[PDB]
Amino acid sequence: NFLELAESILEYFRPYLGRIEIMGASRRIERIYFEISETNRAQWEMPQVKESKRQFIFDVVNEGGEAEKMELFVSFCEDTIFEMQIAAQI
Amino acid sequence: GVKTLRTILSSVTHNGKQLVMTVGLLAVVVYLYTVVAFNFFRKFYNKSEDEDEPDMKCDDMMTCYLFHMYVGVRAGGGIGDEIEDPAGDEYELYRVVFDITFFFFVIVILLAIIQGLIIDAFGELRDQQEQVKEDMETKCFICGIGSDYFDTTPHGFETHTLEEHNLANYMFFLMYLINKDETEHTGQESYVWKMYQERCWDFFPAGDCFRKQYE
Amino acid sequence: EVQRVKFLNYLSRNFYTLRFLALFLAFAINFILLFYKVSVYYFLEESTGYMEPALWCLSLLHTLVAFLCIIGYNCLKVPLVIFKREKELARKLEFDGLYITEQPGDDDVKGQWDRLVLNTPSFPSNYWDKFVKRKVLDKHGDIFGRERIAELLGLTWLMSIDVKYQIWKFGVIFTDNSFLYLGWYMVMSLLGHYNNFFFAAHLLDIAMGVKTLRTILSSVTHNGKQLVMTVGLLAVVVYLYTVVAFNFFRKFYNKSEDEDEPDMKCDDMMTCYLFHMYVGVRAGGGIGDEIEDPAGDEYELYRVVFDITFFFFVIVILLAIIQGLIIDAFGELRDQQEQVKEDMETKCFICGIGSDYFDTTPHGFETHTLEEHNLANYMFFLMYLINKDETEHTGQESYVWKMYQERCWDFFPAGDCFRKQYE
Ligand SMILES: [Zn+2]
Ligand SMILES: [Zn+2]
């Protein structure tokens, strides 16, 4: 009720929003939030990313049920970040 | 260009180590027949200009092999299409069966496996393609569990994915970590940052979910 | 002579690679066998003069290995399979007593040779509990005569040996698939002394090289009972058509040198069936490819529909059935091939349950296997049992040892697991 009262201007902010579950080091699953840079978000949208994600998901679901889901995921992220490190150059 | 054709090359040889046998199994067949053919049946191999003039039947072991390796390996209409017969003569009962051993064993038993070695194989990685889309839309790519439990709220598992787990958020999270100085790290992120330092990556859900865990 | 004994032990010591390189020998023989030509008899060597003469030895060389390998098999699986049969029959008497009771005739076939073997002293040649016979009198003997069951049962080197066991043993040697295999192989090898071209068939050995080809043969043969219907149906159909063909349609079967000269159409019932059996059973392009038509005449619509029936019921149905009959099977047993790794990596090979529950800890179910259940550990535990004296057996291993004695093997998990059972 108070939220809905305060819900008046939050919509602007959802783009900016980043939210995820985490199973933290205390045996609970926090629902933390975090901000996402927009300039970064823009770079994400078009190149070998969304397609790379189509690829990556294929790179995983091809062997995804193994608990490297967590782990294979790692590099893709670090890689696309590097991709944005490259995307920034142009 | 694009995946649709890349599938095809992938078909050829994701499971091509099976294929090793096939041309070898066929060589077997052909080394087999031909030598007996070079023994008991040379006299049927003519491809002379019909009338009795000297010709290139058999003539060499290599050649009679390559002949079947050209013709018989294609066959289609089989060697019996171009062997010189009836014949009509000695060991005819055998040559026919020799033609038949050439036929059930080859025309069918050889070639088909050779086909099906690929065809399922085409249907393998292709089946995975929807299976990708299926597993994204069934089991959660992130927490696992399955869509099923989050479909309990209407249209809800996309909220469990695109709005909750999103998957893609994680990546932005890292750069969110990296851009920040360690001073300003929240203590929740920070072990998680440390967990990045340590790379167990165990803080991704076992598959228990927040609202699943409670309510 | 002990150098020869240990040399054979080297022979077994390298049993596989000899087999493999030998097959490469024969393969090479066969590649290079691509050269002889009669002038009558003569051999066309190309360049080097020594290829055929090397073969004067290579045949025998290959043959040597054959001879070699066979003897090695005698040192290899043979005492193993004998041990296997030994355990078999022995445990059978241990619990069933079939010769005391459920005896074979030529029915229950295996046992017909096996009847005689029990009589021999040396029946328990290598079972390492080689006293079982007295347990057998201990159990089944009370139902009957205690000594009536005993009536059933209980160089120098030349005279020793012990007799009746031996013929059964060589018969067990006959039972083996592998030994027929190497024997057919070697007999062919000696055929190479008679003729090097009949000597080529050794390449067939590739069928066991390796699993993939064995996959293939297995694709064929696991269900030939299905083949029966097809070849039968084919024969059926072929009669079916051919007879009417000998009736209503003889006049279309010519394969005369085009012009009106007498020819080998039909002519006999057999001959026509084998005409279709050479052709129509192949066809591809159909019987209509070499039947003499149009025609263009009487009963044309019926021969044409005849051709159509031939083209559906045969060309399409039969062949393909056979083809699927094979392919579905290749995918079957192949799917069983992946299914091994799948089940090993899903349901626990031991406790069952499924990986799923142990995947709850990360990378966990491999730990539920190799680091918990493993599997080889059971057996290492068994040797561990066997080596220990009964005094020093821990009570757990001791009842378990008894369970070995009794062979229910129930103490292998229902599928409950320790940490699964608790926490
Ligand atoms: Zn998830
Ligand atoms: Zn287990």
Side-chain angles (χ1 to χ4, degrees), chain A, chain B residues 1-214, chain C residues 1-154 156-422:
Chain A
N1 291 335
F2 172 76
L3 190 145
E4 184 279 332
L5 184 157
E7 186 67 17
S8 73
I9 294 97
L10 290 180
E11 299 137 353
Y12 173 75
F13 295 100
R14 283 192 298 272
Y16 302 147
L17 179 57
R19 57 184 282 176
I20 57 169
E21 292 188 352
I22 62 165
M23 174 64 165
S26 65
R27 289 142 184 76
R28 60 172 186 181
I29 295 169
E30 300 178 345
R31 181 77 57 90
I32 57 172
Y33 303 140
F34 60 91
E35 185 271 338
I36 296 169
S37 182
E38 291 303 321
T39 58
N40 290 335
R41 177 63 176 158
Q43 293 172 332
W44 188 88
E45 297 305 318
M46 63 259 334
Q48 182 66 267
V49 178
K50 185 153 289 300
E51 184 173 23
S52 181
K53 204 152 148 302
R54 295 268 246 250
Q55 286 177 334
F56 173 73
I57 293 173
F58 167 79
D59 286 343
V60 171
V61 174
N62 195 31
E63 59 173 334
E66 186 184 5
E68 291 181 350
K69 187 151 69 66
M70 296 191 184
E71 178 68 13
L72 289 173
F73 177 75
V74 173
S75 183
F76 180 73
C77 300
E78 291 173 355
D79 189 63
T80 302
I81 284 175
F82 182 77
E83 182 165 11
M84 290 174 178
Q85 297 300 97
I86 297 175
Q89 293 178 340
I90 297 172
Chain B
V2 190
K3 177 182 288 294
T4 288
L5 269 74
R6 181 174 63 185
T7 298
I8 298 166
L9 176 63
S10 291
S11 296
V12 169
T13 188
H14 70 81
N15 202 350
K17 296 298 288 206
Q18 289 291 90
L19 181 63
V20 174
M21 54 170 231
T22 59
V23 169
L25 167 71
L26 175 161
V28 159
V29 166
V30 181
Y31 289 135
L32 182 56
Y33 290 150
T34 187
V35 183
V36 184
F38 193 79
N39 289 284
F40 289 96
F41 306 98
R42 285 196 51 186
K43 63 162 161 192
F44 304 100
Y45 285 146
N46 287 277
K47 202 172 63 56
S48 59
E49 296 303 320
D50 61 15
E51 191 61 25
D52 58 8
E53 301 157 5
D55 66 346
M56 301 144 281
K57 67 191 177 91
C58 303
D59 192 64
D60 181 70
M61 288 302 275
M62 180 136 148
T63 59
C64 53
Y65 168 77
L66 64 79
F67 182 79
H68 296 297
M69 185 202 190
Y70 168 71
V71 179
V73 174
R74 170 170 264 170
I79 192 59
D81 181 68
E82 289 308 317
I83 193 164
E84 293 308 322
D85 58 352
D89 63 352
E90 199 164 356
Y91 300 141
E92 189 272 337
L93 281 44
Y94 296 133
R95 68 171 299 257
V96 174
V97 176
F98 172 79
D99 178 66
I100 298 166
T101 58
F102 181 84
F103 180 80
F104 285 148
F105 281 175
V106 177
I107 299 300
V108 181
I109 293 170
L110 290 180
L111 300 176
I113 186 157
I114 286 175
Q115 293 172 359
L117 190 145
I118 298 305
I119 305 297
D120 183 66
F122 183 85
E124 168 157 28
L125 181 144
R126 206 163 79 84
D127 177 4
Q128 291 182 321
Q129 294 301 99
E130 299 98 328
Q131 190 59 60
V132 165
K133 283 157 194 57
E134 286 180 346
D135 288 347
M136 181 154 132
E137 300 307 324
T138 55
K139 173 202 70 64
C140 186
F141 188 73
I142 302 101
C143 55
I145 297 177
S147 177
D148 298 332
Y149 173 77
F150 300 97
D151 289 341
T152 56
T153 187
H155 70 283
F157 176 75
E158 62 179 325
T159 61
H160 181 62
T161 60
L162 291 165
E163 287 86 344
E164 287 181 353
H165 290 299
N166 194 339
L167 181 64
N169 283 342
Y170 287 135
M171 69 169 288
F172 289 99
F173 176 78
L174 272 68
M175 62 192 76
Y176 178 76
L177 292 173
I178 289 171
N179 61 33
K180 290 181 64 68
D181 294 344
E182 294 185 330
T183 58
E184 61 181 349
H185 288 165
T186 61
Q188 52 185 26
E189 68 190 340
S190 67
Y191 64 98
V192 180
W193 173 256
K194 211 176 84 63
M195 290 309 169
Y196 170 73
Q197 299 299 97
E198 183 273 332
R199 297 183 177 272
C200 59
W201 294 100
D202 288 346
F203 55 93
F204 287 181
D208 291 349
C209 182
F210 166 81
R211 56 171 297 282
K212 185 183 172 88
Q213 183 57 253
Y214 301 141
Chain C
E1 179 157 15
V2 178
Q3 176 61 253
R4 188 177 185 178
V5 173
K6 187 197 169 64
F7 196 73
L8 276 61
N9 290 336
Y10 163 80
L11 193 149
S12 292
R13 186 167 187 75
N14 194 22
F15 183 74
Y16 294 144
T17 298
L18 57 89
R19 186 66 177 167
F20 189 94
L21 288 164
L23 191 157
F24 176 79
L25 292 171
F27 189 75
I29 293 177
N30 292 340
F31 177 77
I32 296 172
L33 202 40
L34 186 71
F35 296 95
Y36 173 95
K37 279 296 291 196
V38 304
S39 55
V40 186
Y41 303 135
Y42 170 78
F43 177 83
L44 177 159
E45 69 185 341
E46 301 174 342
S47 62
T48 59
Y50 62 90
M51 66 186 94
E52 185 283 332
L55 179 149
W56 167 263
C57 289
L58 288 172
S59 197
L60 286 172
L61 194 137
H62 185 64
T63 299
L64 180 59
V65 179
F67 186 87
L68 185 150
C69 61
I70 65 99
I71 195 65
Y73 186 78
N74 191 29
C75 292
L76 186 55
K77 295 299 180 297
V78 170
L80 184 156
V81 60
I82 293 305
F83 170 78
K84 179 69 181 307
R85 179 71 74 192
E86 188 175 354
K87 182 175 63 82
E88 289 176 342
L89 186 58
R91 66 177 281 284
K92 289 177 189 262
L93 287 173
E94 183 178 2
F95 291 99
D96 291 337
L98 61 89
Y99 289 133
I100 307 300
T101 56
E102 299 90 350
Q103 68 183 18
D106 55 8
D107 294 338
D108 303 335
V109 64
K110 287 306 296 192
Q112 175 70 259
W113 291 347
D114 293 345
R115 291 177 68 81
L116 282 69
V117 70
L118 57 88
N119 200 335
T120 299
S122 290
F123 168 83
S125 67
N126 280 335
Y127 175 74
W128 54 268
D129 280 351
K130 293 188 298 204
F131 293 104
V132 178
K133 179 190 290 186
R134 181 183 51 77
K135 286 177 295 296
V136 173
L137 63 81
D138 189 6
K139 193 180 71 61
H140 297 282
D142 60 11
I143 301 162
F144 292 168
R146 298 286 288 182
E147 298 294 317
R148 184 190 170 273
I149 305 300
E151 174 281 333
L152 179 66
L153 295 172
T156 298
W157 180 259
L158 285 177
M159 184 182 149
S160 61
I161 63 171
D162 292 358
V163 180
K164 290 180 75 52
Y165 175 73
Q166 294 294 322
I167 293 180
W168 174 84
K169 185 197 183 194
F170 294 102
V172 179
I173 293 171
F174 290 165
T175 56
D176 185 55
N177 195 26
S178 180
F179 178 80
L180 176 155
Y181 181 75
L182 270 62
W184 188 86
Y185 182 82
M186 69 158 281
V187 65
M188 191 69 73
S189 299
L190 190 140
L191 290 180
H193 186 66
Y194 174 89
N195 190 33
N196 297 128
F197 296 88
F198 301 157
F199 178 86
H202 290 301
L203 48 76
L204 286 177
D205 180 67
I206 191 71
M208 287 296 101
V210 192
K211 174 176 287 296
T212 316
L213 270 71
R214 183 173 63 183
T215 299
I216 301 163
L217 174 66
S218 295
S219 294
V220 179
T221 188
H222 72 78
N223 208 337
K225 302 302 285 205
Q226 294 306 97
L227 173 74
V228 177
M229 55 189 259
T230 53
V231 175
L233 185 60
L234 177 161
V236 161
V237 169
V238 176
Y239 293 137
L240 173 62
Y241 287 156
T242 187
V243 183
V244 181
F246 192 76
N247 288 281
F248 285 97
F249 302 103
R250 287 195 51 187
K251 62 158 155 194
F252 302 101
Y253 288 142
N254 287 277
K255 202 171 62 57
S256 58
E257 296 303 320
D258 61 15
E259 191 61 25
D260 58 9
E261 302 157 5
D263 66 346
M264 302 145 281
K265 66 190 179 95
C266 302
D267 194 61
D268 181 68
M269 287 304 278
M270 177 140 141
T271 61
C272 52
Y273 166 77
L274 64 77
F275 183 87
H276 299 298
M277 187 203 190
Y278 169 70
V279 177
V281 174
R282 170 172 260 169
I287 193 57
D289 184 68
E290 289 309 317
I291 192 165
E292 293 308 322
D293 58 352
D297 63 352
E298 196 163 354
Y299 300 140
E300 189 269 337
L301 285 48
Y302 295 136
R303 64 171 300 261
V304 167
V305 177
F306 171 79
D307 176 69
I308 301 165
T309 58
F310 177 78
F311 179 79
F312 289 160
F313 286 172
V314 172
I315 301 298
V316 172
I317 290 171
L318 282 176
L319 301 185
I321 189 156
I322 296 171
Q323 289 179 336
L325 185 162
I326 301 299
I327 301 296
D328 190 68
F330 181 83
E332 166 202 316
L333 184 147
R334 191 163 69 81
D335 197 341
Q336 289 181 319
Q337 294 297 98
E338 288 88 7
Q339 186 64 62
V340 173
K341 285 133 209 48
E342 294 177 1
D343 289 347
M344 181 156 129
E345 299 308 322
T346 56
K347 168 207 72 63
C348 188
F349 186 77
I350 299 94
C351 55
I353 296 177
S355 177
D356 297 333
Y357 173 78
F358 299 97
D359 288 342
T360 57
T361 189
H363 68 285
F365 177 77
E366 50 162 330
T367 60
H368 180 61
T369 61
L370 299 144
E371 290 83 353
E372 290 180 350
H373 288 296
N374 190 343
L375 179 63
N377 285 344
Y378 291 137
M379 71 172 290
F380 284 102
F381 174 81
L382 267 71
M383 59 193 76
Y384 177 77
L385 290 172
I386 290 170
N387 62 33
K388 290 182 59 73
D389 295 343
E390 294 185 328
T391 54
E392 65 178 348
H393 288 165
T394 59
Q396 50 183 26
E397 69 186 339
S398 68
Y399 71 94
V400 176
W401 174 255
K402 212 159 88 62
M403 293 312 174
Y404 169 72
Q405 299 300 97
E406 185 271 334
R407 295 185 177 268
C408 59
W409 293 102
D410 289 343
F411 56 93
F412 287 162
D416 290 349
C417 183
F418 169 81
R419 57 168 297 281
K420 183 182 171 90
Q421 183 57 253
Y422 302 143

